[PDB]
Design a protein around this ligand. Sequence first.
Ligand SMILES: [Zn+2]
Ligand SMILES: [Zn+2]
Ligand SMILES: [Zn+2]
Lengths: 447, 101, 333, 86
Amino acid sequence: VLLRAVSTGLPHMIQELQNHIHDEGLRATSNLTQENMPTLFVESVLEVHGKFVQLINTVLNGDQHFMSALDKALTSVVNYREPKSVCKAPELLAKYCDNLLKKSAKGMTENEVEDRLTSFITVFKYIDDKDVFQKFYARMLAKRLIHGLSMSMDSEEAMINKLKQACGYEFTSKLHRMYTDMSVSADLNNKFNNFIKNQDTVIDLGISFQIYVLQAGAWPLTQAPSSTFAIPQELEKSVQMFELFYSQHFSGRKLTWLHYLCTGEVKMNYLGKPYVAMVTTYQMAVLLAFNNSETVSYKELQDSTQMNEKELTKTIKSLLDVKMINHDSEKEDIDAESSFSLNMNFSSKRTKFKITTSMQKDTPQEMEQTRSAVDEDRKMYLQAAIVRIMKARKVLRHNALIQEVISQSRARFNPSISMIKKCIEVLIDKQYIERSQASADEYSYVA
Amino acid sequence: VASIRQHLASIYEKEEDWRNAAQVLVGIPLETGQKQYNVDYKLETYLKIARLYLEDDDPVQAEAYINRASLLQNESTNEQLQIHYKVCYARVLDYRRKFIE
Amino acid sequence: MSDMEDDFMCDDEEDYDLEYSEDSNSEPNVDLENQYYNSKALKEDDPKAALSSFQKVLELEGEKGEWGFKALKQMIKINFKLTNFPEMMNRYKQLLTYIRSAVTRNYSEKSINSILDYISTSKQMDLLQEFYETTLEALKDAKNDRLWFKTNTKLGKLYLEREEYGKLQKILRQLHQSCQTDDGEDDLKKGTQLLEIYALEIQMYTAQKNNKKLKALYEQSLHIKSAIPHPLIMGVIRECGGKMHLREGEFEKAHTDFFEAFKNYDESGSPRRTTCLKYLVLANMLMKSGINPFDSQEAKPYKNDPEILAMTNLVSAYQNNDITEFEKILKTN
Amino acid sequence: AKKKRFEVKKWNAVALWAWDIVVDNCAICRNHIMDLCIECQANQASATSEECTVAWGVCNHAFHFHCISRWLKTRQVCPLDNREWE
Ligand SMILES: [Zn+2]
Ligand SMILES: [Zn+2]
Ligand SMILES: [Zn+2]
């Protein structure tokens, strides 16, 4: 009442409302979840944001001086903290979103979660991280989409929309295609069967048959060479035969190769009750070895396989550390024999822990390894960001740009202010009117 | 595939069956399965497809092939393979009858 | 007659999945063998006389380990092929009770979808409608943002086939009420979803061929701007804009309409794709700009389709202005 | 005995992206293959995400009109897609 009655006080509130809200923003959002459980960090962002907004909820009664301070405060919370990495909240948000979006981590009732996500978006309005969040989430989502362990499809889409109204298009669009990719792809698998191998009558050996479009539009991944795999008949009939019908499916929508969808589900009646399960890659070869002989020696075998050994260091670490796999002999350079043992293991050693098997490392570790690359991508993103910003105005005065970029670069991605003159003079010099020198009148002419 | 097409095209060239050597070479070993080839090897293969159709005087198909090779000569840095490109495009122009060009 | 090997395999595989999810709840129980109850119920090569095992299945189901679900699903499958639909409906309803109660939603959701597939194979539309009705009967829950709607949408498509509009129109009103009109204004998708209703309405009125009404629908679909889901159907509505321009004769706008529509068709597939291209070429000639007939990226290879290649001939003979040739193509084809 | 002996799994490493149809940017002057160029500003065509100014039909070598045409006029072999310039 006083600060309203006396004129000058409110801008001070602009000052004060940012600082402690920011300060606790260091601890309560950032410092409080080092443990790095994603749910915890999201809750921490919620903690600072909600608590302080509630502070505002009082007699402050809106009064935008207060809210603007709050806007700056949260901007400071996510952005301004000691760690340069702004994406940590979105990193923990992405994982958490997947957690909410999957049946695995947290089971809840449908669309209540939407409500929770709604509150998340509300807090999210301040956050700048779409590169990590969108791409990395799409990446994790792609992996989980391969997994299929999801709470639901539509709610995921709802979360997408929550972002979508507010955010950039391709960020959403690629995911849309990824979603549709899976959907239409399942339809495609049905089609691929349905031409000759109808629902009832299939003229094929039959491994699980599912694949995606293998198109340029769907994926967030980068380029990494894989090893040379023999790819047997069932693998052939799943994919390659598909390539035949794929021409029938898409004539003109060409192929970007993706083996990763090779599907396998085993229904085996070894013991009275058909069991559907999933297992590793090597013993299958051993089974093949068994059909033909008892053993397949590594000399000819190695001669036959010739895997590209880029990844092998990580592979070796994983195979040696696991020791879950029934193998002949694991040696450093070359394993002399690959005619692996019988079904030695079941799900777990102990019940408290000592739980860990199927082979985990390839699965969550990829990003773990990729972080160097992703951060490099962050660097690239920033580079692209300056590029994206700097292209905007053809004829201007330099001062005119001021306070323009803030609209484009604040909330969506992390701001990069310092690059302006350098970017103009270095990048922009192509077909444009250049003011390298503002005083004199002259510059570049387009062809 | 790469071996069978080079040798089968060479032995149809022994028979002077230019059309069928061109025809079997349509299934180009490109990037398709295991092997990732060279710009120069595959461009040699495309100019082979070209001269083997143009010896049977198939200007439309080999014109499409020489246009996608005009796309693909931009990556090959050889004189002589681009000289064979000039050979094939000159035969196409003799079939195109575009006498200004 | 006898059940299918394929069906058998499917059940085996999902029991397989039950097990895996069950491993996680290694700690839990109640689901251990009910899967075997399915394995006896469906499997053991006995879809017939198997009925007690369905009862055995009835004891209790979990989320992960839920094989019993597919058992009842198999009885729904059995009730048409083997002994009759009364239990198919009954046990189906039993499955319907399963919305939240100790059962995985995605699993049941997709599995029910496959059930609908089984029914579609069974009583193509006619009995299938009743199963949809019962499904909706499960669907009463407020939480279901799209859930009832989707099921209703499938049933609505059946209505599109049967031409049962009285129910369908009401459904449209109901789903419309699902959106902003009642001031609900929010769901998983924008507002409700407010896209698919446009598609169903357009399809309905196209069946009617009430073009003016279709025009009205187009006017409504100006409102697509309001709701943005992204379905498969997208090329069809864009076709309608061109169609409107077919109604109008304003080929300028129709060109863009068919252009984007054809693109969307490429995205979807070719029920209409070639036709869209036909109209697109027709638009090009009426817009009178032959410069890029096929010339996007794709149409050029697409035109190679000999059925449609005639359109290329038209644009050619039109562009080249050989009346003899052009008319030849007209008269000949 | 024989209950889980390591048969077919789903397995994923990194493959793609962005794709390897090239498809390229009308390189004589090289506004982006989605972007509407200067030569399609007085034209203003509905241009595809791989059509900056591209018509690969019978015309077949169609880039930015006067820039591909300037690469055409000094010698009439315009060899990037190898035909006359649109
Ligand atoms: Zn432009
Ligand atoms: Zn121009
Ligand atoms: Zn272009």
